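Internal ticket - ligand job 455, magnesium ion:
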Amino acid sequence: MYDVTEWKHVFKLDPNKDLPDEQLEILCESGTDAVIIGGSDGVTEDNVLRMMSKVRRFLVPCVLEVSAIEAIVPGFDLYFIPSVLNSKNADWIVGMHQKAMKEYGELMSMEEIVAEGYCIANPDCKAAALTEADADLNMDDIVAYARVSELLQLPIFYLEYSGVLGDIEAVKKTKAVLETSTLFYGGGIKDAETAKQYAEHADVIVVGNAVYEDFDRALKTVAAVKGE
Amino acid sequence: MYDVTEWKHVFKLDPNKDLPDEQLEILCESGTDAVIIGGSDGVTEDNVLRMMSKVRRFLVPCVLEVSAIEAIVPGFDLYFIPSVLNSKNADWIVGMHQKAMKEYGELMSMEEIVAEGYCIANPDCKAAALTEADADLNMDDIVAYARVSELLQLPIFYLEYSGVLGDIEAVKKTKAVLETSTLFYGGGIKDAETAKQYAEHADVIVVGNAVYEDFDRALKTVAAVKG
Ligand SMILES: [Cl-]
Ligand SMILES: [Cl-]
Ligand SMILES: [Cl-]
Ligand SMILES: [Cl-]
Ligand SMILES: [Cl-]
Ligand SMILES: [Mg+2]
Ligand SMILES: [Mg+2]
Ligand SMILES: [Mg+2]
Ligand SMILES: [Mg+2]
Ligand SMILES: [Mg+2]
Ligand SMILES: [Mg+2]
Ligand SMILES: [Mg+2]
Ligand SMILES: [Mg+2]
Ligand SMILES: [Mg+2]
Ligand SMILES: [Mg+2]
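stdout (structure tokens):
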């Protein structure tokens, strides 16, 4: 009974890192619209399983972003399955999902899945390297990828700048072309000011790295976009 | 836009070939549910333009299957843009859609576009070679591509065997997993008996080059499928 078109803020947590249990409880009770567990590069199923067990008690939706088939774990409310639209490797577009349907077809059928169209626009991050993304893009290239996602009707279009602040103009123009898709933006949001700035254009802002860098400051990103 | 979930039979024409006498008009007035202009790599914008000018005048929906952005031509009722799901080359999955939107965004917006998830299951054909398709597939691979097609929201899953008939069991198993999209089957259908056989599982059967080889026999496939 989830609806990402109602969301405004999500925290994305890296199971490859460690967060104190009190901080994890606080993020879950923060008012964020979802807590997303990033099942990515170097991720292990054991860490995803421990995380699931800790966040599932809260009312907030818990989501697993499936970046590696081996790290899939039952128990989450939603499963986000990325397709890296600007990847030069078919494995990151279709390949890996076909292997998953072939090997875990029954599991996939029992879960609530949401496809994400990713556009990785920071050429210097671990994700661009892993996925061989053609990540050095002009604004018109980004807008064209968003149009591809809007055509395929993927429910989410995720503009990913990882650790850097992306060009706000690119967020605005991407949002301009999206009619049916929900625009998720991630990239350098570390405090209330940046969160507000980007929440003016993105439908949902994603705060992740910041949680491990300056927790109190990152926490304020929720009130920044959902508060009075 | 015309509703592909109500179709049962479509003819797919190669714009590089030409039907004699009034055969094109007979085909377009036959009862088929759509006339799709496809082609095999050597497709040119000029040949697509001439074909458009001929088929547009009939009530039957005319569709351009866009296999090259250089050959997009205005004037069709619907445009199908394939994503070759089993391609080893990203350009055949998302690359072209991106080019079309980057180069012809305004045109794309004015046209009715349908994404089509293709699975080329014949490794020995021009289409597999052109699209770098991993086409030597077991039935479980095909079924898994059909599950992905839906994951990606695609309205059409097109199981393609090009010039030969594909495994009927693959058609049946694919139809079984498609819960929300329409299954098009193309490959080697040239007469009524075979058209009827594959129509028991596919949602839409595509009859292609048989129209050039033996037109009268291929024309009978419409009634075979639709009664
Ligand atoms: Cl593991
Ligand atoms: Cl209709
Ligand atoms: Cl003709
Ligand atoms: Cl007519
Ligand atoms: Cl044929
Ligand atoms: Mg909303
Ligand atoms: Mg284990
Ligand atoms: Mg819960
Ligand atoms: Mg919104
Ligand atoms: Mg029907
Ligand atoms: Mg010309
Ligand atoms: Mg017409
Ligand atoms: Mg008309
Ligand atoms: Mg017209
Ligand atoms: Mg049907």
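Auto-summary: Strands of chain A lie at 9-13, 34-39, 62-66, 78-84, 113-120, 156-160, 182-186, 204-207. Chain A touches chain B through 31 residues (CB under 8 Å).
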